[PDB]
Amino acid sequence: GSHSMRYFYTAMSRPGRGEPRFIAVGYVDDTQFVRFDSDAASPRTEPRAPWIEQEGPEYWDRNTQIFKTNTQTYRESLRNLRGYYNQSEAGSHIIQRMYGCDLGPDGRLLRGHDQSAYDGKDYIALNEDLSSWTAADTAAQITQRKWEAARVAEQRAAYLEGLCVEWLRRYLENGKETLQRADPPKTHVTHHPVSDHEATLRCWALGFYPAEITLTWQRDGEDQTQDTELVETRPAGDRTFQKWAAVVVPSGEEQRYTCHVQHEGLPKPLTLRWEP
């Protein structure tokens, strides 16, 4: 199928409690495979998936240097952004970066991504062209100009089109038994009366990978979007995911409602009813 790799960086200042913490995590699709934490007793890049462990010392030290140097630079960046916004030295602030590459089903680069935020709001992003920037405000414009002057976009592009795709493909091959395996949802419908004249129908999807899934209730073939209660897809802790969707229906109209399930791992899309 299609696949992506993303690194997620978080740099958090904490005045009076030491220097800013830097954490980085790496993912292939919905599988985390590495972490680095500057607050660890001995900060180093650590494996978080079995298929990455075969990488040699050279790889681990290469990652660690990258993350150590970034830790320092993000400290500088936090100082700079506090100034760009004329902020006091008293508050805590966060820079986030998420970046990586997407491959289509044939292993080719679909597109690159490189987005940053400050205090949870879009700050600066690399455009799909991998050449130009979008800056959210006049503060971000200062970064844009700095990044233009230093030819930063060319650096990002070369990574996203080169090393990013090459290493993603390596990981996909090495972890093919899991990374390229879609596990379909196990499903069922439960029924719980809420009163004499209403009942809850809950459609369940358990044990699926990847997280992407579509779960909907229909009444008489019409989507019940506004009346459906839909929880966020949640990790089970064994790599798989869970989700449910609930509708409250007139007692006796149960058979007029159908749960539809779309997931990559299903040989066929699913249509379920409550089965008394």
Binding site: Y7, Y59, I66, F67, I95, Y99, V152, L163, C164
Partner: peptide
């Protein structure tokens, strides 16, 4: 593999 360090100075924001 994350983005490698550049040949020069890593550019801060």
């Amino acid at each position: 593999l994350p983005e490698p360090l550049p040949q020069g100075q890593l550019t801060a924001y």
